[PDB]
Amino acid sequence: XXVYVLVIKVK
Amino acid sequence: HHELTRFKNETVPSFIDWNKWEHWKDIRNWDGKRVAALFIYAFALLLSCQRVYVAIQAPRVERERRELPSPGNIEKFKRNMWRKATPKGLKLKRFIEAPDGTLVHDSSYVGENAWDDLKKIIGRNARIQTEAKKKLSQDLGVWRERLATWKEMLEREKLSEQLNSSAAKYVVEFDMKEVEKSLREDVIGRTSETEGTRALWISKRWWRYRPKLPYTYFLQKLDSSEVAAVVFTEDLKRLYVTMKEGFPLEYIVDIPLDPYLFETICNAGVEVDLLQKRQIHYFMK
Amino acid sequence: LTVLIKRGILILIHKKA
Amino acid sequence: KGLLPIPMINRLIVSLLYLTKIRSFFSDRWSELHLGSNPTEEQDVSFVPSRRSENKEIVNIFKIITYLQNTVSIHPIWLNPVKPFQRSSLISSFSKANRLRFLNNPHHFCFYCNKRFPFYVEKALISEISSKSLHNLLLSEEMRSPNVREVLYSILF
Amino acid sequence: XXVXXXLLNXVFXXXXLXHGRXXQXXXXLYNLMXXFX
Amino acid sequence: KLRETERERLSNMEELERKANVQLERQLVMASDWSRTLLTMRGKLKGTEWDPETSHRINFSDFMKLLDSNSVQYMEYSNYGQTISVILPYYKKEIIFRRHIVDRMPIDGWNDVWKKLHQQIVNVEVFNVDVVPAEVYTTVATFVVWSMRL
Amino acid sequence: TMCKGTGSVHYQIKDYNLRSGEKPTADCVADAIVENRAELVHLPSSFNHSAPLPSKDCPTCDGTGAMSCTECKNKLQVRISADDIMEPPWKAYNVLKKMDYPYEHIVHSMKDPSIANFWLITLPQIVGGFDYDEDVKKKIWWQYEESMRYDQLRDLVAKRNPGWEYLQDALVSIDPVRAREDPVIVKNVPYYKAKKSLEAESQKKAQKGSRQRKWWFF
Amino acid sequence: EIHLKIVPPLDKVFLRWLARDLQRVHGFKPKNNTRAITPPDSYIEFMRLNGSLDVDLDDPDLAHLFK
């Protein structure tokens, strides 16, 4: 898939 | 093709005018075609759900039928391997895709807490085969079951880590105090003796034969932190690379003008310079 | 390579021949 | 430096904030970032390491080639599971995920064997004032250096 | 929810984005434009 | 105490082998290029994607739609974007590839076009042909050809 | 720009000169279209509508997607300069000046307090060797927090929490141009609401089917 | 001394859009029978930072007359 740094996922 | 034009002009906008929701939301005047389209959507949803269910389930049944020195030492060895691989403070998560549509957080991948805190030395060398290992151990004068079970358990963890990477998503996080220290260390402290000896040396040894290389491999090796410098020609239509190791060191890569070129030239962290020709060479031509 | 269509039109083209 | 806007200064911040989405009528922040900051913190090149480097490589190539030809043949007919994040420093890998997310393709340069590659690896002054006033150059519509003027004058001659 | 005490008064379009002039400057400029009206 | 000598020997052996690894990678890339340019002239690779044949022209909007439809995976680039071309497979089975030169790619779609191109593309091809040897060819060639007619 | 380069612009009938004694049906409108007694107008595909209108070719570019420079005239289409032979620095710099170095790879990643601290403050202070005034730092922080309103509201409206249409109208009120293209915002609210209810009952009947399909082989 | 022009050689469209947005935001409408609304702490802080809150010390009515 892709790198999903927390600003994408956590917030 | 004659009917398809009118099909676009007067059927599908009229369809969405019938599919306009001022009539749809009122259930008391649902037309027969309206509930017919409702049933069509229901049947399509059922078919798609059943198909994706069986398609997800089938390889799991396939692998089920195909299938049918403490663990702390394993954790420490995986920790050591990951500390060898990537720098400190970068924590990388394997956030696993469930079949249902949710995102499951496992807590056993070594990419998270590896950073968190006469036979051991030799046994930690898996890049070299056990044949030369036992050959040089007989040159030392020093157990085959333990090496056998090391091999078995590394095969097990290799298979499990291969299976975990079929459908997963990944999350980085840096160590902004450590990363800012690295910026102060390697951006401000990179004091190589090679300050400006790149473009001039090419201008002297132009008589060398530098072979050709493609754009995409130039990108794929520039990103890799394998190249020592990048050189721009004054017409911006040739670019003479100068890496750190290879035969030859320098080549010629012909270039398309796009910004992502310059973006990866930046993010790789390579030496950027432009050769300046004189003002006669464009009058000699 | 820079072919000239009449009414003064300059068109850049591919390599050669 | 106009080619690669990350400097490896304040124009970066200005393009980060203000340029990103009519009049917008505010250039004062540019100058406020410019002068609202005060600094408080051998022309002789050496080709010696360059020559010694190619000397090292030409030395190493012979033994590496002997081992390679002892190992490999070519016939006529773990680490991070994300390739960029290996042997890249902290600040180099910092913005790496930022480019990985939007553009996903590395192009993964590995494959060789097509019809073009049947080989296979095997591993083992009265009017002068009026003239001054008359000239209608108020529409410039130019949009370099006087040295370019000299070289272009030579080209014209 | 912590900034939302001001956000409910900050949802009013973009009012802190067009204020860089005093009233007098605005009036001066206004009378210095053309007299079409 | 002598196991550190073993560690150093293994490190040196790993250095040698990974030197050889990257060196063989370069070996394969230059040998691949040499075999490519050797097979190009003989015509044994005629018709494939490495020697395509001309076809009808195309517009910007058709290129945009084929970009939405993920057909574009090979290009031919030259001259700062004023002349470009693309290559398409077709089904005659027999899979053949044809080149189409795009017409008047206007000014400012490229940073959006390269937004999709860079994600579909596997290999771009960039041609380097300067102006001055072409012009020398024009003058000498018209001289010799018209003297041949004479 | 009037078709953005896509070319498939939407079309609409604006006014209809109906005859005295008829009803505004669809076939009468089509018959007026035959004799061109209705105002046929072009709407851009840049405007996205609730009802997809007929998308045909754009007449301003004839389907190509570009307008030729009509400011250039046939009498002055040629120059006299031998600039084309000596490839200049200024042409390359100009053709690269319209490439924008697209910054989207950092703007989206910028939405983090620590990461914003780094990129906005720490990197210029380290590279430049200067130190900011407190007014400069506070104005940077204020403009940043002011800019983060739209992404905070997008995240809050993405929860599908009850009463999300009010935050949807807040999003369409704060910034028009960006809200005209955000895929989270739905054009027709009853459309999405009743389709959601219909999908719920559809997965109910799908469960019925998938549960009575397992009671016949025994 | 001081001089001006009514027809300057500047760009044409920018003046039209500036005037049109000036009409769209201001128009001519004043108001007097209105009580002032309090700004939040954010607008108040920005007004503090921009320095537009300074009392009109330039006017020699009473602010500068004693000084």
Added chain:
Amino acid sequence: XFLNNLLKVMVXFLXXXX
């Protein structure tokens, strides 16, 4: 012209020879 008289009072001294 309060700023003008203020600057008249507090004239400075900068070299900047370039």
Added chain:
Amino acid sequence: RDSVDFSLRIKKRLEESKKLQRDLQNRIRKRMKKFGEEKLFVQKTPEGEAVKGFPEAEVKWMFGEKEVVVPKAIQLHLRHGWKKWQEEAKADLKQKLLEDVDFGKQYIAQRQEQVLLDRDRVVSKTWYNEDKSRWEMDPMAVPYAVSRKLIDSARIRHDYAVMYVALKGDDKEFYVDIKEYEMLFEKFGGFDALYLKMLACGIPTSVHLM
């Protein structure tokens, strides 16, 4: 129950905004019907050229043979109150510094120090060109001096290519180029906005034929 409550507060303030817009539209209709008849229409853009980033489908309003512009409704009502409390706070601080003596002196000393710092900062980027034997300044900080209102007078060569700018309290006529200012701030208004913010501030300007 807090998020739904906040969205209901948003809803009631939006309903207030729509009521405000509707009654302002009604007031505009009642005030402007004395001239002509409304001709509301979405006139299609006659330009076909605006690639400079301007919005589309401008609305031309006719009330007879005249011109009128539709304004914003709630924004004007908020701006009136905000400027009103600006005036009230300024007047309260004025009368307060009229009451006390020490705080007014401290304030005027702070103004003195800030003006000194601003002028020093704007003269930190000057130089003397001895090839032409004149004084030149970075045009980059030329707007910044305008922000403090540091400009004395403006002398303009025609074609708008070079400005000669006077400093308040100084006898020099600094030479600044405007082609470079355009090359720097073409995205931020260019010299059009520069001359416009000379004109808005009521600075003395004059054009010459050099």
